[PDB]
Each structure stands twice: as structure tokens, then as C-alpha cells.
């Protein structure tokens, strides 16, 4: 039918993407071996004796995570060529992953992409999972985004980037890699969804009451989001919205495509079953800042566009009712120039669960992808981190030593200044 | 994939190196004979980083033993886990460098590098993709400080891409061995700054101090000190050998802890560290690890850390554990101890989860910190250097062997700049 | 006559089948001696195989399997290296499925019972005890020898210990897995194990 | 292999009892501090959730790692749910297949799907004790 290719770059991209492929394999009823005991065609191919192989490529320079998948439970589920490994880590150096060691692996990467896209025409687009703060995540992520933009120029490229958090870093050179990648995904990607690590730590703490989480709890929640974005492609629904019409309803200006995410409900096993997941309150449990998945308060922002994807026992009457009460509720502000700022998508298939995982079954759910001007704070805070670094050239010698010219820091800085000014202007 | 080449030079380097291969073989479950026991995939899936197959099933270390007296090489061979090293990897000195950095580097060691650089060339070139080297040596002694630094100089200009990290012990603060410490330590330091990527500093008096109030051992031999230091050594390179939630190799750490190139001296620590008596009375959790790991009384290098500021630091956690409280504790220790840290660099700390714990425990952390507080040790060694040099004392040994008068003034001028560089960032 | 001719298995198989052919011809223009196609043997009788918990397992549950003989020794460092990879391979093959796919029957090169039991305590797949002559006859049939100590009839020693040989219904080697072989592709030649084609009929 | 403890003797349980509910295997010792900690809290939870209403809703098969007949019987006689037979080879089979090391790995609750495999994993060696209420059976019951 019409398919989508998922691309995983970097450590976070591999780990997040593997939870995605655990969920996709589970909901379509295909085993870890890869054979079931045409709705699944958007994520799995056919292969000979009734066995299905995903449309994903695994890319990392260090082998220590991609080799572990090859020896894991899903050893026959992926194509051996689809999991590509190097020998040495990029090591938090955007310069290293983009210039020196990036060129020898990008070729092998886009060979498989070429083969997998030429299977059928009329495919939707690309989903890319990468770490901004990482080396290979930012380095190799730009190289594929650059070279795919020149070849498959027309088509949609969606990005789900693990943006570095305000207080939490677990790194130090990460302000450098953030502003360097931002210059490279302003003019090469179509829609970018910003993810925060410690925001989801907040989600797991108050909504789900997991006082003591881990990365396995992170990637499950991301997998539910990604499934909700691509639910309309797979299953029949009342009113579908595809990945082509995402950028139509959410990107008003070509520069401005940095947009937050939210999911509701994030509810426990025991917590959920004793309370109405009403369609009215399932959205009221989405517009509050604390439910938002970026740690970026939109109260001092203005909503430019909004796209809601419902899943399950959802009727069109309650969707229109839920939108109307939100617009008349005062605490959020819409921009003057965008009256029809809502786009509703309804899918019949209920959310699937990973059993004995973290969440539960609920009869309905909503996933939010909203574009706002709240993004102005997260780039300004990243700029404040970067000016201290660049004030006296700290950790520059690693970057310039490999072959990256000094001064690319200067021009990427002013681009983020140019991006910062545009957001402030459009919010009048 | 990746292999790390081990080089063991000197008296101190052999003993801390013999005990280092004891715990790595323990970790990978290697029989002293050379076979394997321990029926797990994790241990053997990444073993070529430190070992090599021999067509008999036995794994040999990628380690090169190096000394100018055959005595300490004999002792290492003659112990258990002595059979493990290759006989060809031993290189022998027929003369012996008596504490003199001149003969370790200029005269006597110069003709024996030719022998040993061949060994390191044969082993490094044979691998698929070299990552780098680790060298354990002393700086007080002659052979450790002299020839160990020469070999550092030679393979840097030969393999200029690959990383290098040194487990070097310094002259101790209070009492001393090798009376010419400043004539050996200072003469190594100005060369170590030029051709080494990471330097991890160990002090004797720190290890005595650790073993006193924490472990309550009455009689610490070199058996337990080398066992303790080796526990910090395995913690650094665990992520290379085992899978984890957040991976960290040597190159990971080098870009992470080094703001500016010439400042690359560290401060090593390990946790947890409890007595045998009070072994089973503790709550081994991520609050308790971080309290113990940030302490002046836990560092392996007895420079006082709260007399300076932490420029950058890294905490490489180990074990089945969990990624938010380790994450929040890094934020918590940085927020409370604001005066202890540097201002212009935000978010100084690093987190690296290494999913396989050290053997027989459940949860640990190693701490590698680039601190400006280690400028007290460079002054105090230089304070000792000035007193001997102004009086031209013990110099006739060095200048008798073929070393210049102006070389000593250049060395003192080099480290005085190294002090001033660190002093500026307080 | 497959994969070898001068083996105890093939000698006893030829004896039985040709005896049976003669008797049938006497009772009833058949071709003597009988064809390799018309030859038949029972390989593992009822009391041969036994599981982890030392409960007897019949011939009949080897049907629809990819079945392989694991010739292994206690003391060999190469065997000790090979064993955890094959453990992981067995577990990840048999677990990601409703029914099980591959099955491994263990043949020992240990010197004694004590070593046999000590090494066998680890293994969860099927094993044949040391004292059974089946081990020796299978060993000569599949040409496994630790060293050339026994007279072999102009053969070359096909394998060194350890080695996994995928077997067929009639004693024919289904495929060869090159651990220490012509390919020397050690410790990950277990990946080459296909299970479309190698089915225990 | 599986034994239902009742008043007067021990009866084999029908495999129709396990149908329509969630079955958890409980890996435990006897006389261990955490074992003796977790027996009665689980007993209270089991009693309240099964007696609250009409229908039985969960079922826990207890599996031991004990070294004595007497110890096994002693730890088994004070529990309201069924157990696994000490002499059955299924017990050691379960140990080797689920990889409890035989410590911080005790006690353990692994809730099981219809195919006899890991439907969900839960460890008690931690400060929290709301994990009993956290294990929910409305999401993984057998047909």
C-alpha cells in the first residue's frame, strides 16, 4: 500500500526505536520470529514464507547497542543488513560524526534506504529518531537529512528529536551539539517534534506515580505516541489524517516547524479503571502544561496550530464538544491570525498495551502535536548555555581539530538568533 | 571492533598491573590456566578488547611487561595468574635504572625502547581497529618515570590519532621514596602534558588514608592497595566491555572532561567502600552512593577538592540500576555545592550507566574529576624542586648521564605555567 | 553409504537391510544387494535419549525438528568458549515461537562418568550418556575424533572437538556448521544454521 | 505437578481453575527475612481481592527454592493459594527457564500469560510496597 520508513540514528534513536518496534510487532500480531499465527503494510514488508520484516534501518557508529539487538530476542525479525554498525564511537563530537567518520557509513546507510524505498512507489515519508546532544545522533542525523533532502526532495521528513533538558543534562558539551544541529535541521527537515527526557520523568512521577523509573519506561511512552501519529495510516477510522497533511495544518511558515507533544491519558494499572475517561476530560488532561512532553510552559506562549489524534471509542459529537470548551476556556491563548487552529483526527482502533508493562488499557486516548510560540524559551535557554561556552572557546579544540572550520559556531549562533527573532515576531 | 593495549612499566607499574589483570580475568571469569568458566554470554561477547585467542582456546592479555630489572618481572610471572601473560611479551633489562630519569630516558632506556617498541608495533598493527593505550607506571622511580615517558613520546608521534590514558602514581606528600622525586616527577610532567590525553593521578598517602578510616584495615599491604586501585581501573573501561543504558568509552570521557588541551589531569575515586564488619549494615542505594562518592575522604589522590573548584567531572555508575535518581542526584549535588563548582560551565556532571555491576556486588560508581584543586600538588612538587635546584643538588647524576642544564629550567618554567593556568580558573 | 561408507552405522545398516531383503525375496526380480534408497534403520531407540531432568524421551518427538549432534568435551577451552553462545542460540530459537524448532543431542568426549555428569548438569537440551555404544558408533559415523587414536579406514578426520553436525533421517549429514573446519568461522557459524531445509523426517 | 491445599488433605487442582483469571508464579524461600515479610502482605491482598465480590480473580502458584521437605511443608502450610510439588521436575525447569540466580532476587512475582511465559515481571527488593496493588489482573487474564 502506502508505507513509511523509520530511521534510527544514535544511541537514543536505537533504544527509542526498539520500543517502537516492540509495540508495532505486538499490535499487528506478529511474533518475534516475524511470522503471524493488508493493514500492517505501513510498517512491515512481506518475505517469502509468510514472514514480515520492518521498514527500519538501525544506524550507530559504536557497535555496543546495535550488536546487542542482533544477539537479542528479535534476531530474525530484522534484516541483517538493516542494522549497520561501525567500529568507533562519534564521542559527543558533531564535527567528528559529520566530517571524518560520517562519510564511510552514510553510503552504506543510504544504499539500504534506496533499496527499501524503491520496493513500491507512493510511500508517505520518513520518521527519524535521534539524540540532539549525542555525537552520532546529531552528526550522522544531519548527513542523512542533508543527502535525503537532495534526492527525495519532494517528500515529507518528520523528526522526533530527544531535545536536551533544561536542568538535567548528563553531558557538558551538549550546548555545542544542540546549536550545531539546529542550523542543520532548520532547512532540511519538514516537521520536528521536540522531546524532553526529564519532562517524561515528571509525567511518570505524578500521573503514573512511578517514583523510580528507567529508560525502558521512557521508550514505552514514546512508542504509544508514535503509534498514535501513524494510527490513521494502519487502521480504518471515522476521520483520518495522514503524515502528508501534518505539515499542512501545523506549519504556517517554512522556518517555524518546532512543535511540542502531549499524550493523554498516562494512567496506571489500578488508577485508571475506577474513573471515567470522558472525551471532555481526556482533552482537559492534555492542554495543561504539566501534561506537556517538553518541559516548556506554554502559558507564556501563544498557540499557532493544534492537531489532535483520538483513538478508540470516540464519536465526532464529543470531539467538536471538547474543542469548543477548550477554545472558550481562558488560560490558553490563540494567535489572532489563526482562527481555525484545530485539526481533528479520529481512529477506531483502541490503544494497544504492552502487557505487564507500565500503562493499562483505556477505552479512548488522545495524542497532541501542537505548534506554539512557547519554543522561544527553550532556544533562548540553549543560547544562554552556548554563550558561556563560546565566551572563552571552551571545548572548541576538539571540534576544530578534526577538520571543522572555526566560525561555524558563529554562524550557527546567529541562525538560532534569527530563529529566536522569528518566533518573537510571529507571536504579536 | 576495539582493542586496548596495555603497557606496564616500572616497579609500581608491574605490581599495579599484575593485580589489574587479576580482576579483569576475575570479571571475565578467566581461569589462571587461561580457560573460561562462568557460563554467561556477556563476559565473552566483548573479550577481544583486553584478550586474544591462541588456537588452544586460551585467552592471553594484550599487555606488554617492561622493566630494567628481571627481579620484579620474575615475581609477577611466579605469582598465580602469572602463567596468563605471554613469555614473549616480557622484555628484559640487563642493567637497571637506579632512580635516574636521565638513564631511564636518555642513556639506558634509549636502546631498549627499540626492543619494546617492536613488541607494541606487532600487537597493535595485528588488530582490526585500534582504539588506544593505557599505561600504568610510577613517576618517583627511574624506569617508570624515565622509560615509561619515552614510550609515551614515541607512540604518540607514531599513532597520533589514538587515545592515551595513564594510571600514574605521583610522589607522595608527607613522606617519600626516590629522594629525587622532583628531579623525576617534574621532568616527566612537562613531557606528560605534551604527549598524553588523560592522566589519572594516584597517591600513596591517599590509599593509606582510604584504607585507614573507611576499610579499617590495620595492616594494608600492596596486595589490597593494588586491589583497590584496580577496582577504579575496571570501572573506567566497563562500558567498553559490557552493554549499558548510557555507553561511555575513553574517547567519550576525553571530550567530556577536557575544556582546554593542556589541562588533562584528573582525580580518581571509587564507591562504595565499607569495612568487613559494617559490610551488611548499609542501604546500597543511589542516595548513599553519591554521598560517599563526593567526599574529600574518598579520592585516590590526596589533593583537597574543596580547596578548589570542580572544572568538569564525570560519574560512571555501574550495575542494574535506574536513570532518574542518578540523574537527579547529579543535579542535587551540583545545586547544593554551588561554591564547590565552576560558574561559566553549566551542568558539569556526567552520567554513564554501565549495566553490569562489579562482581559480587549490586551497585557501584567510579568518579573521574577534572579539578582545579590539584594545583596544590604541582606547587608542592615544584616547591621541593626549587630548593634542590637553586643549590645545584643531586644534579651531577643527571648532567653526568647526558642531560642539559637548561632542560631543568625549561621543565620548571613549564609546570609553573601549568599551575598558573589552573589558578586562573578558580 | 552416506555421508561415509566404512562406518559401524552403515555396516550394521547394510547387514540388517540386506538380511531383510534376502528373507523377503525368499518369502515372496528384486535387486540384491538392496539400494541405499531402500535401506532403513532406527537411529535412537526408545531408551536412548533422555532430557535435562533424566526422564526418558522417545524417537517420536524429534519429528518436525532441526536436530543436530553436538560433539563436545569437558576439558577443552574451545568447547568452554563455544558453549554459552550455543546456550543463548538454543534459548532464543526455542522461546520466540509457540513450538520449538531446533533440538540438540549431546555426544560426549569426556574421559569418565564424573566429568560427563559435571558438564551435563549445565545443559538443558538432550544428551546421550557416555557408556552407550551409540556415542562411539555415531562418532565414527560422523568422523569426529579428538585425535587419531582409533584406526579409520583411509578417512580424513572431518572435525575436531567441538563440532555440531545437523543430521537427517537416514544418518545423512543435513548440513555442516564450520566452527573449526575449512571455513574456520568460529563461534558464529551457528548463525548459518538454516531450518527450512534441515528437517528430521 | 500442581497441588491445591485444602482442609484435611491435598488435592490436584483442575486446569479449569486457572482459566479466566491472572496466574502469578511466586518465587520464594522459607525462613528468609523478605520471604517472611512478603508471605502475609500477599496473603492479605489475595484474601481481600478474591473475597471482594463473587468470582475468583487471581491465582498465585507458589514455587520454592528450599532445601528440605520439612521446610517446604512448613512454608507451604500457612498459605491460602496452591503450590507446585517439591518432587516434580517442573520446579527446577521453571528455575532454569526464568533465570532466578538462587540475595536481592527474592521474593519475585512473575505474572504469566496463557503460553506459560513472562507476561509481566515484578520485584519486591525495594522500599515500595504499593506494588501489590500495582499488579493488576484486568489487563492480562487468560481466555
Amino acid at each position: 500500500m502506502r508505507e513509511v520508513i523509520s530511521i534510527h540514528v544514535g544511541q537514543a534513536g536505537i533504544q527509542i526505536g526498539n520500543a517502537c518496534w516492540e509495540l508495532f510487532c505486538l499490535e499487528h500480531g506478529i511474533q518475534p520470529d516475524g511470522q503471524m499465527p493488508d493493514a500492517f503494510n505501513t510498517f512491515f514488508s512481506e518475505t517469502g514464507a509468510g514472514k514480515h520484516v520492518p521498514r527500519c534501518v538501525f544506524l550507530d557508529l559504536e557497535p555496543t547497542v546495535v550488536d546487542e539487538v542482533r544477539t537479542g530476542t528479535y534476531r530474525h525479525l530484522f534484516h541483517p543488513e538493516q542494522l549497520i554498525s561501525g567500529k568507533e564511537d562519534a564521542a559527543n563530537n558533531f564535527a567528528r560524526g559529520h566530517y571524518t567518520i560520517g562519510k564511510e557509513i552514510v553510503d552504506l546507510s543510504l544504499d539500504r534506504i534506496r533499496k527499501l524505498a524503491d520496493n513500491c512507489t507512493g510511500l508517505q515519508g520518513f520518521l527519524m529518531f535521534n539524540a540532539v546532544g549525542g555525537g552520532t545522533g546529531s552528526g550522522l542525523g544531519c548527513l542523512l537529512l542533508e543527502r535525503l533532502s537532495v534526492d527525495y526532495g519532494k517528500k515529507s521528513k518528520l523528526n522526533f528529536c530527544s531535545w536536551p533538558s533544561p536542568q538535567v543534562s548528563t553531558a557538558v558539551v551538549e550546548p555545542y551539539n544542540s546549536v550545531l544541529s539546529t542550523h542543520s535541521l532548520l532547512e532540511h527537515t519538514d516537521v520536528a517534534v521536540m522531546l524532553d527526557n526529564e519532562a517524561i520523568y515528571d509525567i511518570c512521577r505524578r500521573n503514573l506515580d512511578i517514583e523510580r523509573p528507567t529508560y525502558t519506561n521512557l521508550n514505552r511512552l514514546i512508542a504509544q505516541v508514535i503509534s498514535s501519529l501513524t494510527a490513521s495510516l494502519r487502521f480504518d477510522g471515522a476521520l483520518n489524517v495522514d503524515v502528508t497533511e501534518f505539515q499542512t495544518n501545523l506549519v504556517p511558515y517554512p522556518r517555524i516547524h518546532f512543535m511540542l507533544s502531549s499524550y493523554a491519558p498516562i494512567i496506571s494499572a489500578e488508577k485508571a479503571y475506577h474513573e471515567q475517561l470522558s472525551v471532555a476530560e481526556i482533552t482537559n488532561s492534555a492542554f495543561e502544561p504539566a501534561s506537556m512532553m517538553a518541559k516548556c510552559d506554554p502559558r507564556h506562549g501563544k498557540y499557532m496550530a493544534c492537531c489532535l489524534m483520538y483513538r478508540g471509542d470516540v464519536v465526532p459529537k464529543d470531539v467538536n464538544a471538547a474543542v469548543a470548551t477548550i477554545k472558550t476556556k481562558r488560560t490558553i491563548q490563540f494567535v489572532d491570525w489563526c482562527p481555525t487552529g484545530f485539526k481533528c483526527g479520529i481512529n477506531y482502533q483502541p490503544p494497544t498495551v504492552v502487557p505487564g508493562g507500565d500503562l493499562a488499557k483505556v477505552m479512548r486516548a488522545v495524542c497532541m502535536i501542537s505548534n506554539s510560540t512557547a519554543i522561544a524559551e527553550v532556544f533562548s535557554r540553549m543560547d544562554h548555555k552556548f554563550d558561556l561556552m563560546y565566551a572563552k572557546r571552551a571545548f572548541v579544540h576538539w571540534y576544530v581539530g578534526e577538520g571543522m572550520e572555526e566560525g561555524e559556531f558563529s554562524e550557527a549562533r546567529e541562525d538560532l538568533a534569527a530563529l529566536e527573532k522569528d518566533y518573537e515576531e510571529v507571536g504579536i | 571492533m576495539r582493542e586496548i593495549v596495555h603497557v606496564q612499566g616500572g616497579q609500581c607499574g608491574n605490581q599495579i598491573g599484575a593485580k589489574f589483570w587479576e580482576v579483569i580475568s576475575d570479571e571475565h571469569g578467566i581461569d589462571p590456566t587461561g580457560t573460561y568458566c562462568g557460563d554467561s554470554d556477556l563476559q565473552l561477547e566483548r573479550i577481544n578488547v583486553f584478550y586474544n585467542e591462541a588456537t588452544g582456546g586460551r585467552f592471553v592479555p594484550r599487555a606488554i611487561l617492561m622493566d630494567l630489572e628481571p627481579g620484579t618481572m620474575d615475581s609477577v610471572r611466579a605469582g598465580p595468574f602469572g602463567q596468563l601473560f605471554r613469555p614473549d611479551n616480557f622484555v628484559f633489562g640487563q642493567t637497571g635504572a637506579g632512580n635516574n630519569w636521565a638513564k631511564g630516558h636518555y642513556t639506558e632506556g634509549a636502546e631498549l625502547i627499540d626492543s619494546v617498541l617492536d613488541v607494541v608495533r606487532k600487537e597493535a598493527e595485528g588488530c582490526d581497529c585500534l582504539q588506544g593505550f593505557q599505561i600504568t607506571h610510577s613517576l618517583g622511580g627511574g624506569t617508570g618515570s624515565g622509560m615509561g615517558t619515552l614510550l609515551i613520546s614515541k607512540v604518540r608521534e607514531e599513532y597520533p590519532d589514538r587515545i592515551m590514558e595513564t594510571f600514574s602514581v605521583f610522589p607522595s606528600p608527607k613522606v617519600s621514596d626516590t629522594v629525587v622525586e622532583p628531579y623525576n616527577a617534574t621532568l616527566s610532567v612537562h613531557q606528560l602534558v605534551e604527549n598524553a590525553d588523560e592522566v589519572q593521578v594516584i597517591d600513596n598517602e591517599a590509599l593509606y588514608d582510604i584504607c585507614f578510616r573507611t576499610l579499617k584495615l590495620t595492616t594494608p599491604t600492596y596486595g589490597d592497595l593494588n586491589h583497590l586501585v584496580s577496582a577504579a581501573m575496571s570501572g573506567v573501561t566497563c562500558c567498553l566491555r559490557f552493554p549499558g543504558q548510557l555507553n561511555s568509552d575513553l574517547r567519550k570521557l576525553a571530550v567530556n572532561l577536557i575544556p582546554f588541551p593542556r589541562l588533562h589531569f584528573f582525580l580518581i575515586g571509587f564507591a562504595p567502600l565499607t569495612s568487613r564488619g559494617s559490610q551488611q549494615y548499609r542501604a546500597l542505594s543511589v542516595p548513599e552512593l553519591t554521598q560517599q562518592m563526593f567526599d574529600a575522604k574518598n579520592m585516590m589522590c590526596a589533593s583537597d577538592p574543596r580547596h578548589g573548584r570542580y572544572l568538569t567531572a564525570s560519574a560512571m555508575f555501574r550495575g542494574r540500576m535506574s536513570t532518574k535518581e542518578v540523574d537527579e542526584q547529579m543535579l542535587n549535588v551540583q545545586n547544593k555545592n554551588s561554591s564547590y563548582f565552576v560558574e561559566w560551565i553549566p551542568n558539569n556532571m556526567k552520567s554513564s550507566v554501565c549495566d553490569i555491576p562489579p562482581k559480587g556486588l549490586k551497585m557501584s560508581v567510579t568518579f573521574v574529576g577534572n579539578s582545579t584543586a590539584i594545583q596544590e600538588m604541582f606547587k608542592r612538587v615544584s616547591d621541593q624542586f626549587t630548593a634542590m635546584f637553586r643549590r645545584k643538588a643531586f644534579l651531577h647524576w643527571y648532567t653526568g648521564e647526558g642531560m642539559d642544564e637548561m632542560e631543568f629550567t625549561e621543565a620548571e618554567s613549564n609546570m609553573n605555567d601549568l599551575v598558573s593556568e589552573y589558578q586562573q580558573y578558580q | 553409504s552416506q555421508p561415509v561408507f566404512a562406518s559401524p552405522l552403515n555396516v550394521e545398516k547394510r547387514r540388517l537391510n540386506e538380511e531383510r531383503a534376502l528373507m523377503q525375496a525368499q518369502k515372496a526380480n528384486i535387486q540384491l544387494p538392496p539400494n541405499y534408497g531402500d535401506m532403513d534403520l532406527i537411529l535412537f531407540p526408545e531408551g536412548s535419549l533422555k532430557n535435562s531432568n533424566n526422564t526418558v524421551i522417545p524417537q517420536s518427538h524429534l519429528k518436525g525438528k532441526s536436530v543436530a549432534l553436538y560433539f563436545a568435551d569437558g576439558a577443552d577451552p574451545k568447547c568452554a568458549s563455544l558453549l554459552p553462545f550455543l546456550l543463548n542460540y538454543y534459548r532464543t530459537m526455542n522461546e520466540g515461537g509457540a513450538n520449538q524448532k531446533i533440538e540438540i543431542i549431546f555426544v560426549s568426549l569426556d574421559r569418565d562418568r564424573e566429568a560427563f555428569e559435571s558438564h551435563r548438569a549445565h545443559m538443558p537440551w538432550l544428551s546421550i550418556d557416555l557408556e552407550n555404544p551409540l556415542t562411539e558408533i555415531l562418532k565414527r559415523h560422523f568422523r569426529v575424533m579428538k585425535e587419531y587414536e582409533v584406526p579409520t579406514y583411509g578417512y580424513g578426520s572431518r572435525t575436531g572437538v567441538p563440532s555440531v553436525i545437523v543430521i537427517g533421517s537416514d544418518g545423512r549429514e543435513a548440513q555442516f556448521l564450520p566452527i573449526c573446519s575449512g571455513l574456520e568461522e568460529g563461534d558464529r557459524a551457528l548463525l548459518r544454521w538454516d531450518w527450512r531445509n534441515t528437517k528430521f523426517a | 505437578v500442581v497441588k491445591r491445599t485444602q482442609q484435611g488433605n491435598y488435592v490436584p487442582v483442575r486446569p479449569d481453575h486457572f482459566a479466566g483469571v491472572s496466574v502469578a508464579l511466586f518465587f520464594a524461600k522459607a525462613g528468609h527475612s523478605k520471604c517472611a515479610q512478603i508471605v502475609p502482605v500477599v496473603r492479605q491482598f489475595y484474601k481481600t481481592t478474591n473475597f471482594s465480590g463473587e468470582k475468583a480473580v487471581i491465582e498465585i502458584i507458589y514455587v520454592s527454592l528450599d532445601k528440605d521437605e520439612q521446610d517446604f511443608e512448613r512454608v507451604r502450610a500457612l498459605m491460602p493459594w496452591c503450590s507446585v510439588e517439591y518432587k516434580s521436575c517442573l520446579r527446577k525447569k521453571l528455575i532454569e527457564r526464568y533465570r532466578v540466580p538462587n540475595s536481592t532476587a527474592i521474593p519475585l512475582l512473575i505474572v504469566i500469560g496463557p503460553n506459560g511465559e513472562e507476561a509481566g515481571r515484578m520485584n519486591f527488593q525495594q522500599s515500595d510496597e504499593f506494588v501489590l496493588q500495582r499488579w493488576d489482573y484486568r489487563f492480562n487474564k487468560w481466555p
Binding site: 526498539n18 516492540e22 505486538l26 499490535e27 500480531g29 511474533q31 518475534p32 499465527p37 546487542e68 537479542g72 530476542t73 528479535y74 528507567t214 529508560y215 525502558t216 494497544t352 504492552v354 502487557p355 | 576475575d26 571469569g29 568458566c37 562462568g38 557460563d39 554467561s40 556477556l42 563476559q43 559490557f242 552493554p243 543504558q245 550495575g319 542494574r320 549495566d355 553490569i356 555491576p357 562482581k359 559480587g360 | 522461546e95 520466540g96 | 533465570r99 540466580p101 500469560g113 496463557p114 503460553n115 511465559e117 513472562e118 507476561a119 515481571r121 492480562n140 481466555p143
Partner: peptide, 22 residues
């Protein structure tokens, strides 16, 4: 006289076979 190795990877302990929806 050593002991078995008693770290289990985070990956292997929870990415195992998973129960199919009915």
C-alpha cells in the same frame, strides 16, 4: 572456587517473548 555471574542485562530481562493479544 568462583561463583556464577549475577548481572542480567536490562534488555534481556524485559525484552523476552511477550504475550499475544487473543
Amino acid at each position: 572456587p568462583t561463583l556464577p555471574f549475577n548481572a542480567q542485562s536490562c534488555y534481556r530481562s524485559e525484552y523476552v517473548a511477550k504475550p499475544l493479544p487473543p
